[PDB]
Amino acid sequence: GPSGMILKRAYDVTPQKISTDKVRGVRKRVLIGLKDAPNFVMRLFTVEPGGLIDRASHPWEQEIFVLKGKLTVLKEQGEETVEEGFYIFVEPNEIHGFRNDTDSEVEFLCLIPKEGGE
C-alpha cells in the first residue's frame, strides 16, 4: 500500500459523540482509522464527568493507555480505578467497561484489531 508518515496533533481531530444502549457521556477521535490502518486502529476516547461505557464483551482484544484523569474500570467482579500513565490489556471476550466518577474529563487511547471496526 501507500508510503509516507502522518504526524498530527490528536486534538486537531473533532471529538464525536458516542451514544448507544451501553455508552453515554463519551466522545471519540479516530486517529488512525480503517481507511489507513493495515492491522489495528487507534482512537482517543474522552469520557465526560459521569460518563459510562457499560460492561460488555467482544471477540477481539483491546489495548488501552490512560492519558488524563482517573478512570474507573468495570470488571467481571467489581471495579478498580486507574489513572494517567496506566495501561490496560483486555483479552478477547473478557467483560469490561469504564466510568468517570470525577468532575473532569478522562482521556484514554484505545486500540483494537481493525476487524472490530473503528
Task: State in angstroms the smallest separation of the CB of 4 from Cu ion.
Answer: 3
Contact with Cu ion (CB under 5 A) among 61, 63, 84, 94: 94
When the beta carbons of 21 and 85 are compared against a second copy, the nearer one is: 85
| Number of Cβ within a 10 Å radius of residue 90 | 19
When the beta carbons of 19 and 91 are compared against a second copy, the nearer one is: 91
85 and 66 Cβ atoms separated by less than 8 Å? yes
Contact with Cu ion (CB under 5 A) among 1, 4, 78, 85: 4
Rounded to whole angstroms, how far apart are CA atoms 92 and 110? 14
The three cell numbers of residue 116 are 472490530
Task: State in angstroms the smallest separation of the CB of 62 from Cu ion.
Answer: 5
Amino acid code (one letter) for 104:
S
